C-alpha cells in the first residue's frame, strides 16, 4: 500500500525566505491530499486539505498545490512560528497513509561552540559508576563531532550524546556527550579528554583533566 515520500526530510531557511515542500506517492491519489503542521511539543493541526484548500484560522502565506502523484506546500514568507515539522496524508485509498515528514529548521550565521568538560562526582563514584560529560554549548549548524581520549586512547561504544532544539532566542544548538565507566575501570586511568571537531573553529578543540591523586 501507498507509502508517502517526503523529501528532503529537513530544510534550513531564513525567516522571510520562501519555503517549498515536496510530498509524493507511489501512485496517483489525484487530490485527496492533506498537510499537517506539528510545532515541537504540540499536536498536529490541519493546514491544507483537498490538496488546495485552507482550513480556517490558517494564514494565507500557507498554500497547497499539485495533483496525482506529486504535491507542493508553500510558505510564502517564513515566520518564527513556521519553524516546525510538516506532514502529508493521502486519503484516496485504504488504508490511510502518512508522509514521513519535513522539518523546517532556521538557517543562521556560523557560531562558536564553547566546550566544557565535567569530572565524575565523588557522589557517583561511590555507587560504582562514572559519567564524564562533555558540553558543546550554543553553536551552529547541528553537524558536529566529539571523540573521547582516555590516556590518549580513542574510545567506542561507551558514550551517548544529546542535542537540544534550536534556541528560541539565538537559534543555536547545544550538545551533551556522556562517557559511562565503572569505578574501577575509571580509577585505573589518568588523562580524560574531549575532542571537538566543528565547522565553526580553527583546528580540533580539546578540553581535559586528570584524576591527580
Amino acid at each position: 500500500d501507498i507509502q508517502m515520500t517526503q523529501s528532503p526530510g529537513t530544510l534550513s531557511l531564513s525567516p522571510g525566505e520562501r519555503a517549498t515542500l515536496s510530498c509524493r506517492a507511489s501512485q496517483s491519489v489525484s487530490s485527496y491530499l492533506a498537510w499537517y503542521q506539528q510545532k515541537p511539543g504540540q499536536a498536529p493541526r490541519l493546514l491544507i486539505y483537498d490538496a488546495s484548500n485552507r482550513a480556517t484560522g490558517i494564514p494565507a502565506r500557507f498554500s497547497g498545490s499539485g495533483s496525482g502523484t506529486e504535491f507542493t506546500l508553500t510558505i510564502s514568507s517564513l515566520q518564527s512560528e513556521d519553524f516546525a515539522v510538516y506532514y502529508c496524508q493521502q486519503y484516496d485509498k485504504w488504508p490511510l497513509t502518512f508522509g514521513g515528514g519535513t522539518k523546517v529548521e532556521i538557517k543562521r550565521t556560523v557560531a562558536a561552540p564553547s566546550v566544557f568538560i565535567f569530572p565524575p562526582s565523588d557522589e557517583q563514584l561511590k555507587s560504582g559508576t562514572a559519567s564524564v560529560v562533555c558540553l558543546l554549548n550554543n553553536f551552529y549548524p547541528r553537524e558536529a563531532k566529539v571523540q573521547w581520549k582516555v590516556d590518549n586512547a580513542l574510545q567506542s561504544g561507551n558514550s551517548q550524546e544529546s542535542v537540544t532544539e534550536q534556541d528560541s532566542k539565538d537559534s543555536t544548538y547545544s550538545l551533551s556527550s556522556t562517557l559511562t565507566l565503572s569505578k574501577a575501570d575509571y580509577e585505573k586511568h589518568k588523562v580524560y579528554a574531549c575532542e571537538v571537531t566543528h565547522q565553526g573553529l580553527s583546528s580540533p578543540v580539546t578540553k581535559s583533566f586528570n584524576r591527580g591523586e
Binding site: 485527496y32 492533506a34 499537517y36 499536536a43 498536529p44 493541526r45 490541519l46 486539505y49 482550513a55 506532514y87 496524508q89 486519503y91 488504508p95 490511510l96 502518512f98 508522509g99 514521513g100 515528514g101 564553547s114 566544557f116 568538560i117 565535567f118 569530572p119 562526582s121 557522589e123 557517583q124 555507587s127 559519567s131 560529560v133 558540553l135 554549548n137 550554543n138 551517548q160 550524546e161 544529546s162 542535542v163 537540544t164 547545544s174 551533551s176 556522556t178 559511562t180 583533566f209
Partner: protein, 220 residues
C-alpha cells in the same frame, strides 16, 4: 471552545491491557466520526482505528486488529480506545482526531496521552552535580549543571533556583541507556561576575515515583 482532552495513559507491562479516553466538548459529538492515531517515540505518524457516528461500524489497522477495539459513549461525549495484549512496539503518544467533512482527513486533534509498554519498573533518578574541576579563569563564560540518571519512565521536569534562573539554561532530552533506563543532564551557562553572590541548584522533579530533589552545585 472545541476541545479534545485525552487521558488514561501511563506505564504498562506487555501483554497487559489499557483503556484510553478522549473527551469532546464544544461541538455536537454524536455527528462526527472519530480516529485514534499514534506516533512512535520520535518517529512518524500511523493511524490506529476509526468509528462511524452512531457507533455501528468500526475499522482497525493490521498491526492493531484483534487486540484493539474502539468504542463510544455519546451520552458522556467521550471516545474510547481499549487496548489488549500490548507489544513493546505499541509504545507511543496517542491522539484522537474526529474526521473533517466528507472523508478520511483529521480536522481536530487532541493534546495526546503517552503509552509506555515495558517490563522495566518505575524508578526514581539519582541527581549528580556537574561542577567543573576547572578551578581556573578568566575564560569568559562559566558552566555548571546536573546529571539526572537512571529513571523510569519519562518524564522529569528540571528547573533552576526554583524559577528565578532561566537564562542560559539547557535541559537535554532524555536518553534511553543500554540498561533500559533514562538519563538527561541539565546545564547552565552564565558569565563570571554575578556568580559571586549567586547560588546554583537543580530542582529535579519526577512524579511517577515522587522524587523531588534540589542539588546545589558547589562553586569553586
Amino acid at each position: 471552545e472545541v476541545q479534545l482532552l485525552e487521558s488514561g495513559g501511563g506505564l504498562v507491562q506487555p501483554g497487559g491491557s489499557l483503556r484510553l479516553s478522549c473527551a469532546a466538548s464544544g461541538f455536537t459529538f454524536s455527528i462526527y466520526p472519530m480516529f485514534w492515531v499514534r506516533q512512535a517515540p520520535g518517529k512518524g505518524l500511523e493511524w490506529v482505528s476509526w468509528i462511524g457516528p452512531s457507533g455501528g461500524i468500526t475499522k482497525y489497522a493490521d498491526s492493531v486488529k484483534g487486540r484493539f477495539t474502539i468504542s463510544r459513549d455519546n451520552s458522556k461525549n467521550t471516545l474510547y480506545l481499549q487496548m489488549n495484549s500490548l507489544r513493546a512496539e505499541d509504545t507511543a503518544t496517542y491522539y484522537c482526531a474526529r474526521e473533517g467533512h466528507n472523508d478520511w482527513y483529521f480536522d481536530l486533534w487532541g493534546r495526546g496521552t503517552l503509552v509506555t509498554v515495558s517490563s522495566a519498573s518505575t524508578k526514581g533518578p539519582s541527581v549528580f552535580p556537574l561542577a567543573p574541576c576547572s578551578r581556573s579563569t578568566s575564560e569568559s563564560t562559566a558552566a555548571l549543571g546536573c546529571l539526572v540518571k537512571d529513571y523510569f519512565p519519562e518524564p522529569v521536569t528540571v528547573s533552576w533556583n526554583s524559577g528565578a534562573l532561566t537564562s542560559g539554561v539547557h535541559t537535554f532530552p532524555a536518553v534511553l541507556q543500554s540498561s533500559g533506563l533514562y538519563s538527561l543532564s541539565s546545564v547552565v551557562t552564565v558569565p563570571s561576575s554575578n556568580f559571586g553572590t549567586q547560588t546554583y541548584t537543580c530542582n529535579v522533579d519526577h512524579k511517577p515515583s515522587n522524587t523531588k530533589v534540589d542539588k546545589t552545585v558547589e562553586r569553586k
